[PDB]
Amino acid sequence: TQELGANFENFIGATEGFSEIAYQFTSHILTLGYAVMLAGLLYFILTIKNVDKKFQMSNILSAVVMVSAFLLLYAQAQNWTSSFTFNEEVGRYFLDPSGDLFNNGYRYLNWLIDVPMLLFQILFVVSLTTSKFSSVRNQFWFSGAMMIITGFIGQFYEVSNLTAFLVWGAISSAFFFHILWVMKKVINEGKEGISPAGQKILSNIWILFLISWTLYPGAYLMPYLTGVDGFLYSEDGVMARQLVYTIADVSSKVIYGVLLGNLAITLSKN
Template identity: 40%
Template sequence: MVSAFLELWRLAQDWRYAFTFSDGLWRPVNDAFSNGFRYVNWSIDVPILLIQLVVVLGLTRKSAISYATKFTIGGLLMIWTGYIGQFYEVTDPIPFWIWGAVSTVFYVYVLFVVWGLISKESDNLPKSPDNLPGMMRFVRSYLFITWTLYPIAYIIPAFWFDGWGVVTRQIIYTVADVTSKVIYGVILGYIARKRSEAIDYEPAMATSRR
């Protein structure tokens, strides 16, 4: 979540200096605004956030390594192929759509693995307190909904060419980042804490050293 906040702060700074107010209008300056920081951040956050599912579900070592590998490779390929495509979003629509389609294949693959993992393992979580299996199934649906915002934002330049299209794309990306990282992390952290309580782990306590 820390990296998500840093990413959003940096993007806000870049967005602020990408325009200047002149003659009653905000006009772009010479340096173009870049989504590069988003892709760098996604390359860090997406594997970590998905691997957190593996940790919270308490998989065996062999299964944990298998799923972590799938999430890391699938997630990075999804991000990097999409990043290649966005270089062509203005200049050449054909490579944009090709790389976007390749990225979508990995996007569907990752969500398919997430769905299968949670469907298979959620019932192994303690049912008391707070019906943790039900909460984990909510996380499954929540990820599908929030992740859907990314491909919507990705294809906006192909249909919406003016300044409002650019602004709308950044708003959707930002909402997606907050919901699929920060809020997702809070929900998963709550499930992890309740799971620890159910199996009699003591909460961490800060102690002073003398």
């Protein structure tokens, strides 16, 4: 009965501890994460005049997303280093009873805030054809909120009840597939009535969206992708999970935002 270690990170940190490499790599990847958001924030502020007025809500939403992600990923980065402390006799980092313990709340809150804005912002760059703005918006927001809420419920049970962790994750995946379906419709309608250069950027946005958003359930399942007591059921699964989350964050937020800005610029060229 391991009482101190909630989530898989605390469980590993309370039982086997983290190697110096695992601890430092995770710290550095999380720091790179918030550093890139700060850089993106300055980018989306400074380039806002490069797009026509009618598209600027997309730049605005990118910047607000950068603020939320910078703040919350900074908090998560400090939560990592504060939750695990070095033991000299073993030579590894263990869960620190005097710390606050690692907490996925920061990242999940960031998702709850950012998912609706990221889905919303494309609607200020492309034009729909036969779909209604309000209908697409409401579907994005409802399914986006439900995907994050049900995923957050599942993640509590990650250590204590693997069955609940997977079932809630499956429910969350149902809302995710709904979002993918709606976004593909948005991309297709967005391609109608624009230049071939604009259509090519939208093609790339779809691939970037599909890959980067699918990385999140992949990192959710990461500790179990090689089975209980498998190679990933260890600090290596923690490292891979946090690496994939950070890649996903930079791609789904920053790169996505840059591509939408590039689309908005191209649309003014006709």
